[PDB]
Amino acid sequence: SGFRKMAFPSGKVEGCMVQVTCGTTTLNGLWLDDVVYCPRHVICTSEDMLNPNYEDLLIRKSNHNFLVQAGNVQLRVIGHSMQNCVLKLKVDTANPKTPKYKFVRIQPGQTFSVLACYNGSPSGVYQCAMRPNFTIKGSFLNGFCGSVGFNIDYDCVSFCYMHHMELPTGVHAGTDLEGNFYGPFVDRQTAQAAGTDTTITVNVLAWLYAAVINGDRWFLNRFTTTLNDFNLVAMKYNYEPLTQDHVDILGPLSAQTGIAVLDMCASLKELLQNGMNGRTILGSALLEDEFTPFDVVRQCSG
Amino acid sequence: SGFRKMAFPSGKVEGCMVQVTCGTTTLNGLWLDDVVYCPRHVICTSEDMLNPNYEDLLIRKSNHNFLVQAGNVQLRVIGHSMQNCVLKLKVDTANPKTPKYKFVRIQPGQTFSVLACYNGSPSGVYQCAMRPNFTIKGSFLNGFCGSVGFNIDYDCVSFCYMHHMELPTGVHAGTDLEGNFYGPFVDRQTAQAAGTDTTITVNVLAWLYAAVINGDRWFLNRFTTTLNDFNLVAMKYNYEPLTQDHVDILGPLSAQTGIAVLDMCASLKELLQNGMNGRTILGSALLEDEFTPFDVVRQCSG
């Protein structure tokens, strides 16, 4: 038993991480087959970032301006190009450690593991949620740009995130591996508003189910509610509305515990309205929303 | 910026994980050079665990009664012995993925990464602290015994933990890689008392320093204190006593922030005496003690 925020094993991804340097900027690249993927902003100087014309900036760059290092081996860049906000460096050697992989665009509320890397060297691994407002609350210092997020399904590594920017508010924004930003963000050093960030209701419910499975049952009550009434309360506390799709996704956890989803919603309703009274749930003094129903089932069934 | 509990990249460890089977019992082993390390209780049936005589149980086993599989690759067991609470199985083939490694017995309050594995297959990675009462709060289901804890310095993996037991209180106990239990625990299914679970004071302080560096400053007050006075308060709240060694370890964080260690202690003292007033620090509604000063510096310095 026990319940922990748990990242996927990072080995398959570690073998794809490289260092990309362009002028004075060093960041991380992802080496799959004979292509290194990294943020296009590597081309820019601190000055360029205020208002970069990437098309023009890219044109002035040559293959020899890109230093790529896989540990001690320098890789030879034989071409460069741009797909949305990601730079693709063609190298003369295919990565022999390329795992089975796909590129996927995740939905808000879904989770993934981040392999935080410093100038091409893996530094650590942690689990994140894509917030409803398409930011993540990560940990990225200088040299951590281009660090990637992923899920591992069976054999396949599903890459879903590449880190590009820290917003002035200190949250993080990035792209999928086709270089399209999550949310309204751009790779320009301007002030950029993130939306109001709501709590991921379906994940809070899943984590309440995890709590019950792990023996923490105090918050269970003998009230119920309807979806509609629960959502009136959710709206008030900046919780995402709950839908029938969400209820359906929680079905297995409901089945396992014998607690109907709308009964769990009534428990959540009370916790929202009355607070937690200085009690904890699974070692937390607040309601946790960075576990999906899948995440809970994966860790409660092993 | 940002601050997150992060584990070391698990790749070097994943390559050492094997499945060990003895009779009907399967668990994890650690394959380094030509030795596989696992919990001795692999020899035991559910019934044996109530009161096992391991010496006698082991004597009825031969080399061929241990099935060791590294993914699909069968290892041939050419010797076996018991070292304290760990079995050492000598195999014909040295693990070609053996990283540089050490065995270390960690101190209470030190942190490490756990690679949670099911029957030889890596499942997930998370960061733990060795509690002052020599338990850890992990996540381990059936078949997760023999999962290991480690730290990585550069290329060297320092293995410090192997999982063996869940106590009836739901916390976890295990050994170092020489098979000596942390704390008073035994590999027997009996009731076993963990001590009072005290809070790791030096780590709470480190994390307060991380909060300041990241701009979360509300709890800073205009008081100071002495070690002795602070410790009278610590004792009362089941905090470990603070020593000059602890103050010394906090030196770099004090230097960075301009906040004297005893001033930070007075802030902590007020938080202990007055609570947090439903406020958060670094996204937490309670005081966090599972980051060491090293952990903080590593993630704030870059």
mmCIF file of N, CA, C and O in Angstrom, chain A residues 13 17-21 24-30 37-39 41-42 112-126 128 136 138-149 161-166 172-175, chain B residues 1-9 295-302:
data_model
loop_
_atom_site.group_PDB
_atom_site.id
_atom_site.type_symbol
_atom_site.label_atom_id
_atom_site.label_comp_id
_atom_site.label_asym_id
_atom_site.label_seq_id
_atom_site.Cartn_x
_atom_site.Cartn_y
_atom_site.Cartn_z
ATOM 1 N N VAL A 13 14.060 7.610 -22.024
ATOM 2 C CA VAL A 13 14.122 9.025 -22.409
ATOM 3 C C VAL A 13 15.521 9.601 -22.194
ATOM 4 O O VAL A 13 15.988 10.397 -23.005
ATOM 5 N N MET A 17 18.426 12.286 -24.693
ATOM 6 C CA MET A 17 18.694 13.668 -24.322
ATOM 7 C C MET A 17 20.080 14.068 -24.807
ATOM 8 O O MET A 17 21.041 13.324 -24.603
ATOM 9 N N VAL A 18 20.146 15.232 -25.463
ATOM 10 C CA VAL A 18 21.397 15.850 -25.922
ATOM 11 C C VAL A 18 21.459 17.355 -25.586
ATOM 12 O O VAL A 18 20.452 17.974 -25.193
ATOM 13 N N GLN A 19 22.670 17.920 -25.709
ATOM 14 C CA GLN A 19 22.938 19.330 -25.455
ATOM 15 C C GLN A 19 22.949 20.017 -26.782
ATOM 16 O O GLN A 19 23.584 19.530 -27.692
ATOM 17 N N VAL A 20 22.225 21.133 -26.899
ATOM 18 C CA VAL A 20 22.281 21.992 -28.082
ATOM 19 C C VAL A 20 22.754 23.376 -27.665
ATOM 20 O O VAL A 20 22.186 23.988 -26.769
ATOM 21 N N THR A 21 23.796 23.862 -28.344
ATOM 22 C CA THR A 21 24.345 25.183 -28.133
ATOM 23 C C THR A 21 24.307 25.944 -29.440
ATOM 24 O O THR A 21 24.661 25.408 -30.484
ATOM 25 N N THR A 24 25.684 31.758 -27.335
ATOM 26 C CA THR A 24 25.814 31.706 -25.882
ATOM 27 C C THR A 24 24.669 30.927 -25.174
ATOM 28 O O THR A 24 24.774 30.605 -23.975
ATOM 29 N N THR A 25 23.594 30.636 -25.916
ATOM 30 C CA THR A 25 22.472 29.838 -25.412
ATOM 31 C C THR A 25 22.750 28.335 -25.522
ATOM 32 O O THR A 25 22.937 27.810 -26.617
ATOM 33 N N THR A 26 22.738 27.646 -24.377
ATOM 34 C CA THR A 26 22.716 26.184 -24.349
ATOM 35 C C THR A 26 21.389 25.702 -23.747
ATOM 36 O O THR A 26 20.914 26.231 -22.742
ATOM 37 N N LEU A 27 20.795 24.736 -24.445
ATOM 38 C CA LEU A 27 19.551 24.108 -23.936
ATOM 39 C C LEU A 27 19.534 22.610 -24.278
ATOM 40 O O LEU A 27 20.535 22.111 -24.802
ATOM 41 N N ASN A 28 18.440 21.923 -23.967
ATOM 42 C CA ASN A 28 18.273 20.502 -24.252
ATOM 43 C C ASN A 28 17.621 20.220 -25.566
ATOM 44 O O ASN A 28 16.730 20.968 -25.988
ATOM 45 N N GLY A 29 18.051 19.113 -26.187
ATOM 46 C CA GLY A 29 17.453 18.577 -27.384
ATOM 47 C C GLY A 29 17.044 17.126 -27.146
ATOM 48 O O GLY A 29 17.613 16.448 -26.298
ATOM 49 N N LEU A 30 16.089 16.656 -27.949
ATOM 50 C CA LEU A 30 15.626 15.289 -27.972
ATOM 51 C C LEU A 30 16.021 14.627 -29.294
ATOM 52 O O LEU A 30 15.573 15.033 -30.360
ATOM 53 N N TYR A 37 15.340 17.470 -31.791
ATOM 54 C CA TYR A 37 14.231 18.442 -31.612
ATOM 55 C C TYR A 37 14.561 19.302 -30.401
ATOM 56 O O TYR A 37 14.975 18.738 -29.339
ATOM 57 N N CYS A 38 14.431 20.623 -30.564
ATOM 58 C CA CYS A 38 14.634 21.556 -29.477
ATOM 59 C C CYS A 38 13.801 22.820 -29.695
ATOM 60 O O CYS A 38 13.207 23.017 -30.755
ATOM 61 N N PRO A 39 13.658 23.685 -28.670
ATOM 62 C CA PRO A 39 12.974 24.957 -28.870
ATOM 63 C C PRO A 39 13.706 25.824 -29.911
ATOM 64 O O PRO A 39 14.900 25.913 -29.838
ATOM 65 N N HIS A 41 13.893 28.921 -30.031
ATOM 66 C CA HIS A 41 14.414 30.136 -29.353
ATOM 67 C C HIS A 41 15.917 29.973 -29.053
ATOM 68 O O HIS A 41 16.520 30.938 -28.578
ATOM 69 N N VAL A 42 16.465 28.779 -29.254
ATOM 70 C CA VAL A 42 17.925 28.534 -29.076
ATOM 71 C C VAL A 42 18.666 29.471 -30.040
ATOM 72 O O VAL A 42 19.738 29.943 -29.672
ATOM 73 N N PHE A 112 1.739 13.837 -16.916
ATOM 74 C CA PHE A 112 2.881 13.239 -17.627
ATOM 75 C C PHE A 112 4.118 13.372 -16.757
ATOM 76 O O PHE A 112 4.122 14.156 -15.827
ATOM 77 N N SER A 113 5.152 12.600 -17.079
ATOM 78 C CA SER A 113 6.426 12.721 -16.380
ATOM 79 C C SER A 113 7.317 13.725 -17.117
ATOM 80 O O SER A 113 7.328 13.765 -18.335
ATOM 81 N N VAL A 114 8.086 14.515 -16.365
ATOM 82 C CA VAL A 114 9.065 15.434 -16.906
ATOM 83 C C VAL A 114 10.445 14.927 -16.534
ATOM 84 O O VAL A 114 10.728 14.673 -15.365
ATOM 85 N N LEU A 115 11.314 14.802 -17.532
ATOM 86 C CA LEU A 115 12.727 14.521 -17.295
ATOM 87 C C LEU A 115 13.421 15.884 -17.388
ATOM 88 O O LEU A 115 13.663 16.414 -18.466
ATOM 89 N N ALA A 116 13.669 16.485 -16.234
ATOM 90 C CA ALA A 116 14.341 17.787 -16.148
ATOM 91 C C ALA A 116 15.813 17.564 -16.406
ATOM 92 O O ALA A 116 16.450 16.741 -15.747
ATOM 93 N N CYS A 117 16.338 18.278 -17.403
ATOM 94 C CA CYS A 117 17.687 18.097 -17.876
ATOM 95 C C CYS A 117 18.373 19.450 -17.877
ATOM 96 O O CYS A 117 17.759 20.453 -18.239
ATOM 97 N N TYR A 118 19.654 19.455 -17.493
ATOM 98 C CA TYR A 118 20.542 20.647 -17.504
ATOM 99 C C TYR A 118 21.563 20.491 -18.634
ATOM 100 O O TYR A 118 22.417 19.587 -18.550
ATOM 101 N N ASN A 119 21.472 21.327 -19.671
ATOM 102 C CA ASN A 119 22.432 21.296 -20.778
ATOM 103 C C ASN A 119 22.736 19.885 -21.270
ATOM 104 O O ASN A 119 23.909 19.521 -21.473
ATOM 105 N N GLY A 120 21.670 19.092 -21.448
ATOM 106 C CA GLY A 120 21.737 17.782 -22.052
ATOM 107 C C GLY A 120 21.916 16.623 -21.109
ATOM 108 O O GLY A 120 21.841 15.512 -21.540
ATOM 109 N N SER A 121 22.143 16.904 -19.823
ATOM 110 C CA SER A 121 22.345 15.887 -18.793
ATOM 111 C C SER A 121 21.105 15.742 -17.916
ATOM 112 O O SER A 121 20.725 16.681 -17.224
ATOM 113 N N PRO A 122 20.446 14.565 -17.908
ATOM 114 C CA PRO A 122 19.294 14.344 -17.033
ATOM 115 C C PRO A 122 19.599 14.669 -15.567
ATOM 116 O O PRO A 122 20.599 14.205 -15.052
ATOM 117 N N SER A 123 18.725 15.446 -14.929
ATOM 118 C CA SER A 123 18.927 15.882 -13.572
ATOM 119 C C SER A 123 17.893 15.313 -12.620
ATOM 120 O O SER A 123 18.188 14.989 -11.480
ATOM 121 N N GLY A 124 16.638 15.225 -13.063
ATOM 122 C CA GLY A 124 15.628 14.613 -12.250
ATOM 123 C C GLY A 124 14.326 14.379 -12.969
ATOM 124 O O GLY A 124 14.175 14.749 -14.137
ATOM 125 N N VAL A 125 13.407 13.713 -12.266
ATOM 126 C CA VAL A 125 12.155 13.273 -12.876
ATOM 127 C C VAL A 125 11.018 13.527 -11.907
ATOM 128 O O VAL A 125 11.106 13.239 -10.728
ATOM 129 N N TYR A 126 9.919 14.088 -12.408
ATOM 130 C CA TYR A 126 8.733 14.387 -11.577
ATOM 131 C C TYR A 126 7.484 14.350 -12.443
ATOM 132 O O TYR A 126 7.583 14.492 -13.678
ATOM 133 N N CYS A 128 3.759 15.812 -13.503
ATOM 134 C CA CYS A 128 3.114 17.108 -13.680
ATOM 135 C C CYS A 128 1.713 16.871 -14.218
ATOM 136 O O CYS A 128 1.470 15.877 -14.854
ATOM 137 N N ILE A 136 2.073 24.551 -16.808
ATOM 138 C CA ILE A 136 2.467 23.562 -15.816
ATOM 139 C C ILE A 136 3.232 24.295 -14.715
ATOM 140 O O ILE A 136 3.835 25.322 -14.945
ATOM 141 N N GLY A 138 6.193 23.518 -12.985
ATOM 142 C CA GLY A 138 7.354 22.650 -12.996
ATOM 143 C C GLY A 138 8.502 23.216 -12.187
ATOM 144 O O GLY A 138 8.314 24.100 -11.325
ATOM 145 N N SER A 139 9.699 22.695 -12.474
ATOM 146 C CA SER A 139 10.944 23.169 -11.894
ATOM 147 C C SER A 139 11.982 23.160 -13.016
ATOM 148 O O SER A 139 12.454 22.098 -13.437
ATOM 149 N N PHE A 140 12.283 24.363 -13.513
ATOM 150 C CA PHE A 140 13.183 24.554 -14.627
ATOM 151 C C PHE A 140 14.064 25.774 -14.342
ATOM 152 O O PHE A 140 13.560 26.894 -14.284
ATOM 153 N N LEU A 141 15.370 25.536 -14.186
ATOM 154 C CA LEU A 141 16.351 26.612 -14.028
ATOM 155 C C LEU A 141 16.978 26.886 -15.373
ATOM 156 O O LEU A 141 16.543 26.342 -16.378
ATOM 157 N N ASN A 142 17.984 27.771 -15.400
ATOM 158 C CA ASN A 142 18.743 28.034 -16.615
ATOM 159 C C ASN A 142 19.366 26.724 -17.124
ATOM 160 O O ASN A 142 19.881 25.930 -16.335
ATOM 161 N N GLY A 143 19.247 26.497 -18.438
ATOM 162 C CA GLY A 143 19.739 25.303 -19.092
ATOM 163 C C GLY A 143 18.758 24.129 -19.121
ATOM 164 O O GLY A 143 19.090 23.075 -19.666
ATOM 165 N N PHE A 144 17.564 24.313 -18.542
ATOM 166 C CA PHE A 144 16.530 23.266 -18.524
ATOM 167 C C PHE A 144 15.511 23.339 -19.657
ATOM 168 O O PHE A 144 14.757 22.391 -19.852
ATOM 169 N N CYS A 145 15.560 24.416 -20.432
ATOM 170 C CA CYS A 145 14.667 24.493 -21.608
ATOM 171 C C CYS A 145 14.904 23.273 -22.501
ATOM 172 O O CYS A 145 16.036 22.788 -22.549
ATOM 173 N N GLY A 146 13.867 22.833 -23.202
ATOM 174 C CA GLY A 146 13.922 21.664 -24.042
ATOM 175 C C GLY A 146 13.765 20.335 -23.316
ATOM 176 O O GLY A 146 13.651 19.329 -23.978
ATOM 177 N N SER A 147 13.759 20.347 -21.976
ATOM 178 C CA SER A 147 13.347 19.197 -21.194
ATOM 179 C C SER A 147 11.943 18.744 -21.669
ATOM 180 O O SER A 147 11.091 19.596 -22.009
ATOM 181 N N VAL A 148 11.718 17.415 -21.695
ATOM 182 C CA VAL A 148 10.489 16.873 -22.255
ATOM 183 C C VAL A 148 9.628 16.156 -21.225
ATOM 184 O O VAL A 148 10.116 15.668 -20.169
ATOM 185 N N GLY A 149 8.334 16.160 -21.521
ATOM 186 C CA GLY A 149 7.330 15.408 -20.802
ATOM 187 C C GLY A 149 6.841 14.231 -21.642
ATOM 188 O O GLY A 149 6.763 14.307 -22.866
ATOM 189 N N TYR A 161 5.168 16.790 -24.334
ATOM 190 C CA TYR A 161 5.531 18.155 -23.883
ATOM 191 C C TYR A 161 7.020 18.421 -24.125
ATOM 192 O O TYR A 161 7.879 17.553 -23.851
ATOM 193 N N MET A 162 7.312 19.632 -24.585
ATOM 194 C CA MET A 162 8.662 20.183 -24.549
ATOM 195 C C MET A 162 8.626 21.557 -23.899
ATOM 196 O O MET A 162 7.803 22.413 -24.250
ATOM 197 N N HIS A 163 9.507 21.758 -22.918
ATOM 198 C CA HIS A 163 9.544 23.018 -22.194
ATOM 199 C C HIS A 163 10.198 24.146 -23.013
ATOM 200 O O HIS A 163 11.303 23.994 -23.527
ATOM 201 N N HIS A 164 9.514 25.282 -23.080
ATOM 202 C CA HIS A 164 10.042 26.451 -23.825
ATOM 203 C C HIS A 164 10.211 27.680 -22.927
ATOM 204 O O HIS A 164 11.284 28.268 -22.947
ATOM 205 N N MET A 165 9.194 28.035 -22.149
ATOM 206 C CA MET A 165 9.286 29.333 -21.438
ATOM 207 C C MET A 165 8.822 29.370 -19.992
ATOM 208 O O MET A 165 7.906 28.626 -19.638
ATOM 209 N N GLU A 166 9.498 30.187 -19.191
ATOM 210 C CA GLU A 166 8.962 30.530 -17.894
ATOM 211 C C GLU A 166 8.278 31.888 -18.050
ATOM 212 O O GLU A 166 8.897 32.852 -18.494
ATOM 213 N N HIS A 172 5.135 27.709 -16.166
ATOM 214 C CA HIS A 172 5.849 27.252 -17.325
ATOM 215 C C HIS A 172 4.880 26.966 -18.454
ATOM 216 O O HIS A 172 3.770 26.459 -18.238
ATOM 217 N N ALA A 173 5.360 27.242 -19.667
ATOM 218 C CA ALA A 173 4.631 27.003 -20.889
ATOM 219 C C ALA A 173 5.540 26.305 -21.885
ATOM 220 O O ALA A 173 6.767 26.510 -21.895
ATOM 221 N N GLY A 174 4.923 25.501 -22.748
ATOM 222 C CA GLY A 174 5.644 24.722 -23.726
ATOM 223 C C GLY A 174 4.780 24.211 -24.834
ATOM 224 O O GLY A 174 3.643 24.609 -24.966
ATOM 225 N N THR A 175 5.357 23.329 -25.646
ATOM 226 C CA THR A 175 4.722 22.845 -26.846
ATOM 227 C C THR A 175 4.572 21.322 -26.836
ATOM 228 O O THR A 175 5.198 20.604 -26.033
ATOM 229 N N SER B 1 12.819 28.666 -12.443
ATOM 230 C CA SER B 1 12.229 28.602 -11.069
ATOM 231 C C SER B 1 11.149 27.514 -11.000
ATOM 232 O O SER B 1 11.019 26.691 -11.918
ATOM 233 N N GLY B 2 10.403 27.509 -9.890
ATOM 234 C CA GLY B 2 9.498 26.443 -9.519
ATOM 235 C C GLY B 2 10.206 25.569 -8.509
ATOM 236 O O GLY B 2 11.428 25.550 -8.464
ATOM 237 N N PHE B 3 9.444 24.847 -7.693
ATOM 238 C CA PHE B 3 10.050 23.918 -6.746
ATOM 239 C C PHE B 3 9.228 22.672 -6.622
ATOM 240 O O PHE B 3 8.070 22.752 -6.248
ATOM 241 N N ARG B 4 9.843 21.537 -6.974
ATOM 242 C CA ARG B 4 9.139 20.240 -6.984
ATOM 243 C C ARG B 4 9.961 19.103 -6.370
ATOM 244 O O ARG B 4 11.180 19.103 -6.527
ATOM 245 N N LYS B 5 9.289 18.174 -5.690
ATOM 246 C CA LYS B 5 9.932 16.971 -5.216
ATOM 247 C C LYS B 5 10.312 16.139 -6.458
ATOM 248 O O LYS B 5 9.430 15.766 -7.252
ATOM 249 N N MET B 6 11.615 15.952 -6.669
ATOM 250 C CA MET B 6 12.078 15.196 -7.810
ATOM 251 C C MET B 6 13.053 14.094 -7.480
ATOM 252 O O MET B 6 13.799 14.150 -6.509
ATOM 253 N N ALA B 7 12.980 13.049 -8.296
ATOM 254 C CA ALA B 7 13.719 11.816 -8.087
ATOM 255 C C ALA B 7 14.839 11.894 -9.043
ATOM 256 O O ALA B 7 14.781 12.632 -10.000
ATOM 257 N N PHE B 8 15.891 11.115 -8.802
ATOM 258 C CA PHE B 8 16.957 10.999 -9.776
ATOM 259 C C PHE B 8 16.508 10.239 -11.025
ATOM 260 O O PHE B 8 15.623 9.394 -10.939
ATOM 261 N N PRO B 9 17.086 10.523 -12.208
ATOM 262 C CA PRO B 9 16.793 9.746 -13.410
ATOM 263 C C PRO B 9 17.086 8.273 -13.083
ATOM 264 O O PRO B 9 18.117 8.038 -12.425
ATOM 265 N N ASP B 295 19.422 18.867 -1.383
ATOM 266 C CA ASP B 295 18.340 18.818 -2.342
ATOM 267 C C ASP B 295 17.940 20.239 -2.771
ATOM 268 O O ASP B 295 17.766 20.524 -3.967
ATOM 269 N N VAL B 296 17.763 21.124 -1.781
ATOM 270 C CA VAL B 296 17.369 22.498 -2.040
ATOM 271 C C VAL B 296 18.417 23.230 -2.863
ATOM 272 O O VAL B 296 18.085 23.892 -3.847
ATOM 273 N N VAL B 297 19.678 23.148 -2.437
ATOM 274 C CA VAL B 297 20.781 23.857 -3.105
ATOM 275 C C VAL B 297 20.884 23.404 -4.546
ATOM 276 O O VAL B 297 21.043 24.234 -5.440
ATOM 277 N N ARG B 298 20.786 22.084 -4.757
ATOM 278 C CA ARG B 298 20.850 21.440 -6.100
ATOM 279 C C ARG B 298 19.788 22.059 -7.015
ATOM 280 O O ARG B 298 20.094 22.308 -8.188
ATOM 281 N N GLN B 299 18.589 22.306 -6.489
ATOM 282 C CA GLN B 299 17.473 22.793 -7.274
ATOM 283 C C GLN B 299 17.318 24.320 -7.293
ATOM 284 O O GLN B 299 16.591 24.860 -8.128
ATOM 285 N N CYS B 300 18.014 25.025 -6.407
ATOM 286 C CA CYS B 300 17.933 26.511 -6.421
ATOM 287 C C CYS B 300 19.165 27.072 -7.132
ATOM 288 O O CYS B 300 19.012 28.018 -7.916
ATOM 289 N N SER B 301 20.332 26.509 -6.854
ATOM 290 C CA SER B 301 21.594 26.932 -7.512
ATOM 291 C C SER B 301 21.579 26.671 -9.020
ATOM 292 O O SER B 301 22.022 27.555 -9.771
ATOM 293 N N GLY B 302 21.081 25.516 -9.451
ATOM 294 C CA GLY B 302 21.147 25.173 -10.883
ATOM 295 C C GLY B 302 22.273 24.203 -11.190
ATOM 296 O O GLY B 302 21.983 23.162 -11.816
#
